[PDB]
């Protein structure tokens, strides 16, 4: 109804990224997670969560696609 457009974008991109990684579409999934990270700005807590959640090589694709 008001602001919070960035918050919607953020969660939608995380969720789509997650879904694509699960279908095995790594580049696309990583693309969308990095859209979420880009709108964060203090993404240190987010990046820790992602590191604990993703297989290491998928996480490394993320750090590179930033």
């Amino acid at each position: 109804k008001d602001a919070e457009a960035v918050q919607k974008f953020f969660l939608e991109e995380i969720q789509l990224g997650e879904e694509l990684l699960a279908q095995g579409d790594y580049e696309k999934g990583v693309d969308h997670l990095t859209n979420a990270i880009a709108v964060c700005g203090q993404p240190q807590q987010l990046l820790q969560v992602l590191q604990q959640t993703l297989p290491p090589p998928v996480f490394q694709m993320l750090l590179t696609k930033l």
Partner: peptide, 12 residues
């Protein structure tokens, strides 16, 4: 609003 969106973004 949507709490889930607010809470999820709180860390940013």
């Amino acid at each position: 609003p949507r709490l889930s969106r607010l809470l999820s973004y709180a860390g940013c």
